[PDB]
Amino acid sequence: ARSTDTFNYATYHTLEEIYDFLDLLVAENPHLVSKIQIGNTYEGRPIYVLKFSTGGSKRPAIWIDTGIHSREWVTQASGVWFAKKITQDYGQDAAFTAILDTLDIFLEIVTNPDGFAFTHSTNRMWRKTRSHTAGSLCIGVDPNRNWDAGFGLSGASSNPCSETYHGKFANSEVEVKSIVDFVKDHGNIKAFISIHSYSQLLMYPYGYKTEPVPDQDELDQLSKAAVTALASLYGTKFNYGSIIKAIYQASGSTIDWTYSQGIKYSFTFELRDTGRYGFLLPASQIIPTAKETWLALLTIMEHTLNHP
Numbered sequence: 001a002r003s004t005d006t007f008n009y010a011t012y013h014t015l016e017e018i019y020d021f022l023d024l025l026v027a028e029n030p031h032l033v034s035k036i037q038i039g040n041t042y043e044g045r046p047i048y049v050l051k052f053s054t055g056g057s058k059r060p061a062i063w064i065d066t067g068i069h070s071r072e073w074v075t076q077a078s079g080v081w082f083a084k085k086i087t088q089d090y091g092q093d094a095a096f097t098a099i100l101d102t103l104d105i106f107l108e109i110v111t112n113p114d115g116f117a118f119t120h121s122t123n124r125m126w127r128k129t130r131s132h133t134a135g136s137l138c139i140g141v142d143p144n145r146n147w148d149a150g151f152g153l154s155g156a157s158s159n160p161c162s163e164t165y166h167g168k169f170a171n172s173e174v175e176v177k178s179i180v181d182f183v184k185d186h187g188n189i190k191a192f193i194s195i196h197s198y199s200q201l202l203m204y205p206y207g208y209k210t211e212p213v214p215d216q217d218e219l220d221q222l223s224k225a226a227v228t229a230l231a232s233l234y235g236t237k238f239n240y241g242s243i244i245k246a247i248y249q250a251s252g253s254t255i256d257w258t259y260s261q262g263i264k265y266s267f268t269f270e271l272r273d274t275g276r277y278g279f280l281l282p283a284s285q286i287i288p289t290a291k292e293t294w295l296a297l298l299t300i301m302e303h304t305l306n307h308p
């Protein structure tokens with residue numbers, strides 16, 4: 001509202017309200033938080049990433065994104081909560097302070113702004129970007145099928161109208177290319193966590209093929225530790241495994257690409273629930289979802305911190 005302390009974290013917000021929150025959080029924490037514009041969407045909206053840092057030069061970092069699929073509202077709502085949580089816990093909570101004293105955190109709360117705006121104005125269930133496709137009347141590309149990892153292979157659709165349309169070519173969507181450019185420019189991302197809903201799952205590579213990733217044992221043990229931490233709060237049960245075994249085959253997905261780039265701790269979350277409400281999760285579950293998810297994120301960040 002007028003400050004991030006008066007902001008209502010227990011309700012769903014519009015794009016403008018979240019963008020205003022970004023500016024308020026930065027103004028209130030000028031030496032801890034920075035707002036970086038990594039690009040502009042298809043429709044021209046700025047794409048923002050929040051940088052949380054306590055100093056250093058090109059420190060190893062954790063990347064977290066929410067809302068790549070616009071209709072998964074509990075993710076952007078959780079992202080806003082995570083942002084505030086970082087500013088509340090740094091310097092107060094021993095464990096988190098340790099994390100941020102060595103690692104920087106980059107958080108993209110609304111990874112698909114055009115889609116988010118559309119879920120408020122026209123279609124609550126919109127998933128894709130809002131770009132046009134030459135030769136078609138159908139709008140949008142599935143941003144989670146647009147990455148250059150098994151691009152265009154089984155696990156994606158070539159039909160522009162499909163919810164899983166992969167696009168003309170890898171990185172065709174500016175929302176995806178902006179992240180790709182950022183990751184390459186930064187060059188020191190150690191963990192990359194892309195958050196979705198729903199299903200209650202914590203997954204690692206790969207989604208496009210059944211071959212296990214070289215670091216399967218470590219990532220699987222880390223996943224078990226993370227879901228155990230998550231369950232400790234409210235008892236919420238999450239299953240885990242590779243994308244392909246835990247949910248289904250998906251090509252051109254984010255973490256298959258980030259992992260191929262050398263970011264070992266590449267994970268994707270599927271938050272509450274398992275389908276009762278699905279994408280339409282009640283607002284009263286935003287904070288509980290964010291709180292339990294944060295415990296799992298802390299598990300991954302600490303593991304990352306301790307395995308340089």
Ligand SMILES: C[C@@H](C[C@H](C[C@@H](CCC(=O)O)C(=O)O)C(=O)O)C(=O)O
Pocket residue numbers: 069144196197198199243247250253254268269270
């Ligand atoms: C329940 C949801 C699952 C779906 C899974 C997701 C693959 C797994 C992941 O990257 O988290 C995908 O892009 O299809 C999602 O969160 O977009 C859906 O059916 O849209």
Ligand SMILES: [Zn+2]
Pocket residue numbers: 069072144196197
């Ligand atoms: Zn999704």
